[PDB]
């Protein structure tokens, strides 16, 4: 991957679109 994901999935590891944050983008 490209950290399309690795900040994402990972953001998603954080809880995705329901994280305390928002997506990688």
Experimental method of this PDB entry = NMR
Q: How far is CA 18 from CA 1, 4, 21, 23, in A?
A: 22, 17, 7, 9
Tokens of 10: 């990972």
Residue-wise DSSP of 1-25: --SSSTTTTTTTTTTGGGSSS----
Sorted by sequence, the CB contacts under 8 Å of residue 22 that are 6+ apart come out as 11
R_g of the chain computed on alpha carbons: 7
Tokens of 17: 């679109």
Q: From CA 2, how far away is CA 16, in angstroms rounded?
A: 17
């Amino acid at each position: 991957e490209e950290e399309a994901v690795r900040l994402y999935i990972q953001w998603l590891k954080d809880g995705g679109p329901s994280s305390g944050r928002p997506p990688p983008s």
